Amino acid sequence: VNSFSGYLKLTDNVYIKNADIVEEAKKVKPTVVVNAANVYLKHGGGVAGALNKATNNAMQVESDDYIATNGPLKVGGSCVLSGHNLAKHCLHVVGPNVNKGEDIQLLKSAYENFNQHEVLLAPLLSAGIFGADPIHSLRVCVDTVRTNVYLAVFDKNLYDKLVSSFL
């Protein structure tokens, strides 16, 4: 039993809520929060910009040191860094950005990173500015992640569409 509240169960291991992931993280303080990162860990907008803002830019400072040491992530890859005030750990995961011509098939590889963690609070990957269809992303999530994932969907209209169209 854990501290997540008000989620709709989609499958044995996938749950979904219309919520701001930043507010969910501040309330729950989960072991792992997922960031929807780019390969440079430049946390400008969306989930990444909002999470970083809530850490008072400490996420960006840590991330710049990580990149200076290790170079960029792969599209489809991830790294584990601190969760700062929001969680024990942040799993920075890079979904493909279809607006940059990146292969949508890498979305499955991105979600595979979640399987290294027993429980995660996460957004839909490759949605929003990454260009991809959120309905497809939820489907890939459900068909790929085996560990327990609590999805926070920011847009109410999208949340309603995802639930009403889920199969």
Distance between CA 85 and CA 80 in Å, rounded? Answer: 15
33 within 8 A of 87, measured Cβ to Cβ: yes
Smallest distance, ligand A1CJ4 to C-beta of residue 69, A? 26
User: How many residues of this chain interact with ligand A1CJ4, rule: CB under 6 A?
Assistant: 18
Token look-up 């992303």 returns 137
32 within 8 A of 89, measured Cβ to Cβ: yes
Smallest distance, ligand A1CJ4 to C-beta of residue 151, A? 8
Regarding 129 and contact with ligand A1CJ4 (CB under 6 A), the answer is: yes
CA distances in angstroms from 92 to 10, 146, 159, 161, 164, listed in the order given:
24, 18, 23, 26, 29
Specify the residue, 68 or 111, whose C-beta has the smaller distance to ligand A1CJ4: 111
Smallest distance, ligand A1CJ4 to C-beta of residue 2, A? 19
For residues 33, 23, 141 and 40, what is the CA-based torsion angle, rounded to 10 degrees? -50
**Stretch in the footprint of ligand A1CJ4 (CB under 6 A) among 7-15, 69-77, 82-90, 125-133:** 125-133
Smallest distance, ligand A1CJ4 to C-beta of residue 62, A? 19
Specify the residue, 10 or 69, whose C-beta has the smaller distance to ligand A1CJ4: 10
**The one among 8, 20, 66, 72 contacting ligand A1CJ4 by CB under 6 A:** 20
